[PDB]
Enzyme design. Sequence first.
Site, PDB file in Angstrom:
ATOM      1  N   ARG A   1      37.418  48.629  33.017  1.00 35.53           N
ATOM      2  CA  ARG A   1      36.532  48.320  31.844  1.00 35.53           C
ATOM      3  C   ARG A   1      36.839  47.000  31.148  1.00 35.53           C
ATOM      4  O   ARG A   1      38.005  46.631  30.912  1.00 35.53           O
ATOM      5  CB  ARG A   1      36.487  49.475  30.863  1.00 35.53           C
ATOM      6  CG  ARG A   1      35.755  50.707  31.475  1.00 35.53           C
ATOM      7  CD  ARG A   1      35.835  51.891  30.497  1.00 35.53           C
ATOM      8  NE  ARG A   1      35.531  53.141  31.186  1.00 35.53           N
ATOM      9  CZ  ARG A   1      35.956  54.350  30.821  1.00 35.53           C
ATOM     10  NH1 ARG A   1      36.747  54.519  29.762  1.00 35.53           N
ATOM     11  NH2 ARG A   1      35.602  55.407  31.554  1.00 35.53           N
TER      12      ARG A   1
ATOM     13  N   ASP B   1      44.142  48.673  41.369  1.00 29.56           N
ATOM     14  CA  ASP B   1      43.898  49.571  42.504  1.00 29.56           C
ATOM     15  C   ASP B   1      44.964  50.608  42.590  1.00 29.56           C
ATOM     16  O   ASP B   1      46.133  50.280  42.404  1.00 29.56           O
ATOM     17  CB  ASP B   1      43.896  48.786  43.770  1.00 29.56           C
ATOM     18  CG  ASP B   1      42.805  47.723  43.757  1.00 29.56           C
ATOM     19  OD1 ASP B   1      41.662  48.079  43.396  1.00 29.56           O
ATOM     20  OD2 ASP B   1      43.137  46.546  44.018  1.00 29.56           O
TER      21      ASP B   1
ATOM     22  N   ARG C   1      38.859  43.548  34.319  1.00 26.64           N
ATOM     23  CA  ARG C   1      40.303  43.754  34.591  1.00 26.64           C
ATOM     24  C   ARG C   1      40.335  44.392  35.985  1.00 26.64           C
ATOM     25  O   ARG C   1      39.370  44.983  36.382  1.00 26.64           O
ATOM     26  CB  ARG C   1      40.919  44.719  33.556  1.00 26.64           C
ATOM     27  CG  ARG C   1      40.770  44.253  32.090  1.00 26.64           C
ATOM     28  CD  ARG C   1      40.462  45.405  31.144  1.00 26.64           C
ATOM     29  NE  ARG C   1      41.573  46.268  30.988  1.00 26.64           N
ATOM     30  CZ  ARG C   1      41.623  47.513  30.480  1.00 26.64           C
ATOM     31  NH1 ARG C   1      40.578  48.207  29.984  1.00 26.64           N
ATOM     32  NH2 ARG C   1      42.815  48.083  30.448  1.00 26.64           N
TER      33      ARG C   1
ATOM     34  N   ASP D   1      46.148  53.623  45.317  1.00 27.22           N
ATOM     35  CA  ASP D   1      45.925  54.202  46.618  1.00 27.22           C
ATOM     36  C   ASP D   1      46.913  55.328  46.897  1.00 27.22           C
ATOM     37  O   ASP D   1      48.038  55.286  46.405  1.00 27.22           O
ATOM     38  CB  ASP D   1      46.165  53.162  47.760  1.00 27.22           C
ATOM     39  CG  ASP D   1      45.224  52.061  47.692  1.00 27.22           C
ATOM     40  OD1 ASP D   1      44.051  52.378  47.435  1.00 27.22           O
ATOM     41  OD2 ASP D   1      45.662  50.915  47.905  1.00 27.22           O
TER      42      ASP D   1
END
Length: 160
Positions: A85, A97, A94, A99
């Site tokens: 956001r 990530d 921004r 995973d």
Amino acid sequence: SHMIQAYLGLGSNIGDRESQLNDAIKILNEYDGISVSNISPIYETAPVGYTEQPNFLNLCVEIQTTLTVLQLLECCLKTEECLHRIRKERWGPRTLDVDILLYGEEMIDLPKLSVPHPRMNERAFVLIPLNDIAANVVEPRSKLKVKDLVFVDDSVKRYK
Ligand SMILES: Nc1nc2[nH]c(S)nc2c(=O)[nH]1
């Protein structure tokens, strides 16, 4: 209520990168079915994929979770959405990530998700911080422990 130990890989190259990593860990630990149990050091890492973009900070986190792997993937996507956001339009978006690197000792191969992460053995920005918290965990595709998969890469350096 079988608890599974899982490892997640986190990365950010835009904005207050350390703050993005810290917030993601905090959000993940706030889910009822996830408890953060260990965190690797942060490493600064040269970008993999497109070379003209900023360096990443990367870490890995150990979690104890009662969620299914697909429930865990949901929490990861919800956490990415949230930390993407904008704050100020003029400061830009921004990045973050999250995973799933390992889920117990399971191999999972679904259209929507492969775990262990399928090319994760190619990525020093994963394996170096993974080795700090999961050295003795067997990566089930290769049958190597993380400590034996890890390799030298001068593009990955401890951040603090
Ligand atoms: N070093 C590095 N390169 C990356 N490329 C993408 S996409 N994600 C990443 C990441 O998290 N780290």
